[PDB]
Structure formats: C-alpha cells, structure tokens
Design a protein around this motif. Sequence first.
Motif, PDB file in Angstrom:
ATOM      1  N   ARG A  62      41.598  37.254  41.195  1.00 45.70           N
ATOM      2  CA  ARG A  62      40.592  36.221  41.003  1.00 45.70           C
ATOM      3  C   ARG A  62      40.828  35.153  42.075  1.00 45.70           C
ATOM      4  O   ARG A  62      39.886  34.462  42.477  1.00 45.70           O
ATOM      5  CB  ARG A  62      40.695  35.620  39.597  1.00 45.70           C
ATOM      6  CG  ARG A  62      39.441  35.762  38.751  1.00 45.70           C
ATOM      7  CD  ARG A  62      39.181  34.483  37.961  1.00 45.70           C
ATOM      8  NE  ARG A  62      40.319  34.097  37.120  1.00 45.70           N
ATOM      9  CZ  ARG A  62      40.913  32.907  37.152  1.00 45.70           C
ATOM     10  NH1 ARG A  62      40.482  31.963  37.981  1.00 45.70           N
ATOM     11  NH2 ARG A  62      41.934  32.648  36.348  1.00 45.70           N
ATOM     12  N   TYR A  80      50.367  37.776  42.089  1.00 45.09           N
ATOM     13  CA  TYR A  80      50.015  38.986  41.365  1.00 45.09           C
ATOM     14  C   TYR A  80      51.201  39.947  41.679  1.00 45.09           C
ATOM     15  O   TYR A  80      51.805  39.864  42.755  1.00 45.09           O
ATOM     16  CB  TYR A  80      48.614  39.557  41.712  1.00 45.09           C
ATOM     17  CG  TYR A  80      47.463  38.624  41.379  1.00 45.09           C
ATOM     18  CD1 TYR A  80      46.887  38.615  40.110  1.00 45.09           C
ATOM     19  CD2 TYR A  80      46.985  37.711  42.316  1.00 45.09           C
ATOM     20  CE1 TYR A  80      45.853  37.729  39.786  1.00 45.09           C
ATOM     21  CE2 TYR A  80      45.958  36.816  42.002  1.00 45.09           C
ATOM     22  CZ  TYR A  80      45.386  36.838  40.739  1.00 45.09           C
ATOM     23  OH  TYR A  80      44.381  35.958  40.410  1.00 45.09           O
ATOM     24  N   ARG A  90      49.926  41.674  35.121  1.00 48.44           N
ATOM     25  CA  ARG A  90      49.005  41.061  36.101  1.00 48.44           C
ATOM     26  C   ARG A  90      49.587  40.016  37.064  1.00 48.44           C
ATOM     27  O   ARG A  90      49.426  40.162  38.276  1.00 48.44           O
ATOM     28  CB  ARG A  90      47.613  40.720  35.540  1.00 48.44           C
ATOM     29  CG  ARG A  90      46.751  39.934  36.506  1.00 48.44           C
ATOM     30  CD  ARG A  90      45.301  40.260  36.355  1.00 48.44           C
ATOM     31  NE  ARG A  90      44.525  39.157  36.882  1.00 48.44           N
ATOM     32  CZ  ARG A  90      43.408  39.297  37.571  1.00 48.44           C
ATOM     33  NH1 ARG A  90      42.915  40.506  37.811  1.00 48.44           N
ATOM     34  NH2 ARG A  90      42.774  38.231  38.036  1.00 48.44           N
TER      35      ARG A  90
HETATM   36 CL   LIG Z   1      43.515  35.852  36.726  1.00 53.30          CL
END
Ligand SMILES: [Cl-]
Length: 767
Positions: free
Chosen positions: A117, A146, A153
């Motif tokens: 993201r 990440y 995640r």
């Molecule tokens: Cl995220």
Amino acid sequence: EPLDDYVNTQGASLFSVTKKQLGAGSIEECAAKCEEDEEFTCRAFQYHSKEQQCVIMAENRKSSIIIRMRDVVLFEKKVYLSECKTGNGKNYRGTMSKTKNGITCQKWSSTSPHRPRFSPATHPSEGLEENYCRNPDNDPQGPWCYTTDPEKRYDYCDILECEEECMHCSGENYDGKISKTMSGLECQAWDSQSPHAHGYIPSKFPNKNLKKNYCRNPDRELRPWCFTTDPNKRWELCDIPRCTTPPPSSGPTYQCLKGTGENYRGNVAVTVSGHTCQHWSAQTPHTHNRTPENFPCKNLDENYCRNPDGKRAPWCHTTNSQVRWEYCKIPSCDSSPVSTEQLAPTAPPELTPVVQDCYHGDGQSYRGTSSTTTTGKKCQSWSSMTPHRHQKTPENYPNAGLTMNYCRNPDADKGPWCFTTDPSVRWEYCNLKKCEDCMFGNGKGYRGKRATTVTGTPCQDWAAQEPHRHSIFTPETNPRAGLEKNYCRNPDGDVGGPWCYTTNPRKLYDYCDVPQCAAPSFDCGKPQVEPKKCPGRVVGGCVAHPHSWPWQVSLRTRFGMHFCGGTLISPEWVLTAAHCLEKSPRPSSYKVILGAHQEVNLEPHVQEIEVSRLFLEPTRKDIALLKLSSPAVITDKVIPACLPSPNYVVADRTECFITGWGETQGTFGAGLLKEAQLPVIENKVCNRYEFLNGRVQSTELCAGHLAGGTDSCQGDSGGPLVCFEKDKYILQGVTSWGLGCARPNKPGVYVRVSRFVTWIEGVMRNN
Ligand SMILES: [Cl-]
Ligand SMILES: *[C@@H]1O[C@H](CO)[C@H](O)[C@H](O[C@@H]2O[C@H](CO)[C@H](O)[C@H](O[C@]3(C(=O)O)C[C@H](O)[C@@H](NC(C)=O)[C@H]([C@H](O)[C@H](O)CO)O3)[C@H]2O)[C@H]1NC(C)=O
Ligand SMILES: [Cl-]
C-alpha cells in the motif's frame, strides 16, 4: 542550519553515476541546487573551487567509493549517513533490512510476497528505497517494512536510538545539542580559550567531536561536561537525559580473565589479599562514584570484581575500613584467535625529523620518518581505514614503503603526502623541503617571478583566455592577487601553494615549485642534531644524542659542581627553578655551562658563563631567570628553546621530553645528558581523586604515565620540559622536583611556562 546538515571533506571525490554537473559561484549556490531536489535524491555534492563547477549526486560513501583529489570539497547529507533513529524515525534514512524479529524485508518496489500500500510510486517523498525500514505513515511504533515471510505482511524493525535527545551509558558517544551545565551556566566553546585556557583543542582531537559549545565526554568522565563561561568555574558536568532504549551492541563478555578484564562479567567477589568486595550500589565503608547509576553499561552488579575504568585488572572497593580498594585475581581464559592480546590502535610515536627532512624529485623514493602535513596535521596510518578509507595500502603498493603513518608518494603525485587524522581533510602534502625568490607559508603573499610549473610547462598569462578560458582568477576578478603576466600565484591560499594556468592544452593548471624562504640563522627550539627521541616505555630514559638539546644548561657552583638544570631562553637569559637558588643569593655563586653533554669532563667547546643577575618570579617564586655575565655564543650546540604563547595549554597526551643529568649511581649513562619521553596529562585528569586530588593549580602542568611507569625524579631541578610542535621544541615546563616527583600511577608536576611568559619577556625588556 546552514551547512550543519552536511559532513564536509576537503580533498575528497566521491565517484558517481546518477549525477548532474553544472557551473556555480559558491558552495552555498551549489548546496541550494542540491536542496532543490529534482530527478534524484541529492545525497551529496562536490564543489571544484578552481573550476566554478558543482556536481550534485545521489551517491554516498555508504553506496559508492571516495578517492583523494585536488581542490574539490565534498559535502554529504548527514541524514543519509545517520544509521540511527530519533523519535518515530519519520526522517530515518538508514539501511536496516530486517525487522525486530530478524526477518528480511521485501523491497518497497516489489509486489511479492506482498503487494504494498506504501511504495515509491505513491509516497515519492518517503525515501522508500531498497528493502530498508521506513516510517511512511509516521506510526508511533517506528520503522517497519514489508516482510519476505508470506504469512507475515509487515513488522517493525529494531533501529537503535539517535544520541541527539539522549545519551547511552556515560555519553562517550553523546553528540547532542545541550550546551549548559548542571547549574545552568552556558558552556564555553571548545575552540575558545576564554575565559578558560585548556587542552581540549578540537584540532588536536577531531574524532572527539568537540563541536561549538556542546556538552561532551571525550575523556571517560561520569557524564558529558563542558568548560564554562563563568570565569570562577572552569568546568562542570551537564544534565544529559538517559535513554530508555537498549544500548548499542557491545561484547564479547567473559566469566574468565582476558587482558585487563574490561570484558569480565563473572561472579568473583574477593580481592587478591583476600578482602570482601563492597557492593557497588553501597557507600559504606567507602564513598565512591563507580555506581550502577553512573556506569550502567559496566554491569557493576552486587559486589562482583569489575574493571569499569582503565585499570590493570578487575578490582573492587573492600568492606575493610582500612583498604579502600584492591585488585582481584581473576583466572585467565583459555585459547582463541581474537583475544590473543591483539586489538586496538593506540597510534605511533612522534618520530618526525626536527632537522627538516628533504626529498628528491617527486619524492617517490623518500623513505623518511616525517609524518606531519604542511598545516601541522598528523598523518593517518596507511594500514588504518579510519578516519579515511582508502586503497593506498602496502598490499596494493608493495614497493612504495607504506609503513606506519610516514609521508610517502604511492600514486606518483608532485611530492610526498598522507591521509590526515582530521575527519574533514582527507589528505595534504607533507611538511618537507625539496633537497632570492621564495615564499612564506602557503604563499598567498608571494609576488616573485617564477613562471614554471612543477612539470616544466610554462604558465599561461593570467590576462590570457587562450589556450585556457577562465571565468575566475583574471586580473579584474582578483585585483589584489598580483596576477601579473604569467607569474605563479596563490590567490586562493590553496594548501598546495602557488600555481598557474598552464600552456599545456591538456592541463588546465598546475603547481609551481616555490621554495620556502631560508630564515637568517639559528631559530629557537630547532636542534642541529636530531634528538633520538627515547621511546616511552624505557626506565631511566636514554642518553641524549649529543647536543640534540642545545638549550640545555648545567647550573654549577663556583667549584665545577653540576647541581641544577636550566633552559637557555635567549643569549643572555636562562630559566631555572627557584629551588636552584636556595643555597646562595649571590649571582656570582653560579656558573651556567652551555652546549655540554658530559657532566664532568666537559668537551673543549663548552661555554662557561657567570650569572650577573637573579630574578625570582614574584607571584609563585617557583622559577627564576638568570641573566648571563656576557651573551652566550649561539652555535649548532648552543641554541635557545622557544617560549610558548601566553597561557598556551599543552594538549592532553602531547609527547614531551624532560632532559638533564641523572644523579643515579648504579646505572649506565652516568654523567651523560639524558632524556625521557613523557606524555602531558591534562590538569582536569591529573587532578582527579585517584592521582592528585585537587592539588594542581593552573600555573602548573602534569607529565608522565598513570600506569606504574616510574617512581623517581627525572632530569634536574630547573631542567627543561620541551614539547615538539610542528617545526620546533617549545619549553612547556620547568622541572621543580619538590613540587611532586612522578610516582607509580601518578604523573610528575612541572611549572607551566606559558603562565609566566609575560613576566619573563617583561624581565627581559627592562633588564
Ligand atoms: Cl498495509
Ligand atoms: C600503541 O600503544 C601501545 C600501548 O598503549 C603500545 O606501545 C603499541 O606498540 C605495540 O605493542 C603491541 C603489543 O602491546 C603490538 O604487538 C605492536 O606491534 C605491531 C602492531 O600491532 O602495531 C605488530 C604488527 O606486526 C605490526 N602492525 C600491524 C601488522 O598492524 C607492527 C610492527 O610491524 C611489529 O611490531 C613488528 O613485528 O607493530 C607494538 O609495536 C602502540 N602502537 C603503535 C606504536 O602502533
Ligand atoms: Cl585516495
């Protein structure tokens, strides 16, 4: 800031690929174009003084390579070199690539194992580079990334805290901005000598980060401290907040003895003589400051033996009211290839030739002991990668003679050079002469008629724009620089001396070989015989090289009896200890013998001069000036010592020599001028409880070892304590004997000459 956000390095060139080169008038103009960040993240910048050129690059010393180069100044954005985090680490730009669980990051530009993201596409200003930990969203939990773990995640990373707001341990590496003491007094700047003269000179200790007027811990104090602007308070500890975060990675720890036991973490709680250790957290039976609170990273737990300071082996305070402290006997460890008694640097001694050494041609053949640059800086060792990393190693240049920190010329430049110990100056040429029209210093003032470069190529006229165009250094741009015809000039006071634009189409500019002016005759403090410079770890010192200490005087009675030393300060004046004059108040009772080496059987050249006057220093009455009946004849064996500048404070660890005729019976070198090398012990350190508990005043100085070196009295009463400085020996102390002789684990105390120079020069101009 303005440039407080950059690390400056003169003589350094970072090679880069992703860059932008352009013309600029100033460093500030160049810095601006870096800050105006377009195309890439300008991580560093190069400014080429003589070419008005400016390079802006996305490379750092971390990601690229630096080389030694001419004129160029390198400025690297601190932020990108800073491997630590502050608060949340919003502005963190380090290289941490694993989370706090040690799992490898994913790159911000990959979409596997996770499709991010936050990415460089979306958060262009976020520094989302490589797989490095960053704080795009300014999460109160600090950098994360990440993960390469598919069922995980992201996760946070364990970046160690930045010593800007707080200190770890005792603040050895504290580089914060607090500039007032415990009591609230504003700190005196480290580079200033007012109101307090001191030895913590930044130029002497560049790696100690004695920046502006900030609290620092350069010497193993309890905490960072500073000198104060209050004339009545020399120094005071500062109030530095302690960090709650874990301290940086240090080890390995042993349950057995290795070296001086600094790494000991065992549980022995008894001394060698069998005493019970007092708990470090307790103040009975003995009061002390070696507490777990003051020294958290030393593990001063229970009453276990520890070596938290710089002692020979582990120790402890004892529960015995009669024995304050004692060493413990810790069993040594076993075999291993790390703690084989090999580690740490220490640096070599100062073996630079006083009788200025010379080189032939370009000096690629020079094999001397010189290790001082043109500006007085000390050379970095060729084998060390600190403060400057380089590839001029004995392995890459086997025949260049790359040993210790001596001046050499591995890369076939114009003359011998060395990497400097100053973090801000990569390298400089050495202070060496090449084996009337001459210059002084760097020749900014030179107006001579030399017109030839070091290669033999003639200079281009300064007024000419052919073969080389030059927008700067024209007779109109620099009207006060004496840019007449094609004379070698140093308009920019370049460390390299006079230069010129050359007529060689392929070489823009080059240096000219302009010799340093000769000087009339014998200068103070410059022996005509090279002192042998007796190494530190020698008991009783050495026999001096005959006449290598030409200011050395022998005070004698009217009956040929040597009973004191003195220092020739000028042809009619000798400085000695007032103690030497105790026997008689009559000037006639004293004979000053000059240029001697033998104590009894004087060489035929020795000068014997009667004292006509005796001037006792009134304020302290610890030293006295002897006026000679007739002026001394200055020769290669009789030369006065230089006097320091008023209030000069010799820097801690400065190597000095005490000279004189030792009165020792059962030893070799009896009746011969001897010398002993002593390092100066700064007054703040010399004055601590363990040595001379507040017993040393500023009109005095300390010299000698703190680890069981000697136990007698060196030189002669009134004898010299000289310290080499750049080109010459300066008389920094006068031996006084009765003041306090150097005993084991305590330095000697001398009269600090710098505090009596005004009085001396005063007595010398009137009488
Ligand atoms: Cl995220
Ligand atoms: C540093 O000061 C200390 C005390 O604080 C010492 O006086 C030191 O001298 C050296 O002592 C140690 C042992 O305590 C070394 O063994 C050293 O010798 C070495 C060195 O490590 O520098 C060994 C090594 O072979 C070589 N250096 C390398 C490979 O980096 C040189 C030299 O070629 C050899 O000694 C010859 O076999 O020195 C002692 O010299 C002080 N450090 C100095 C003077 O650099
Ligand atoms: Cl280099």
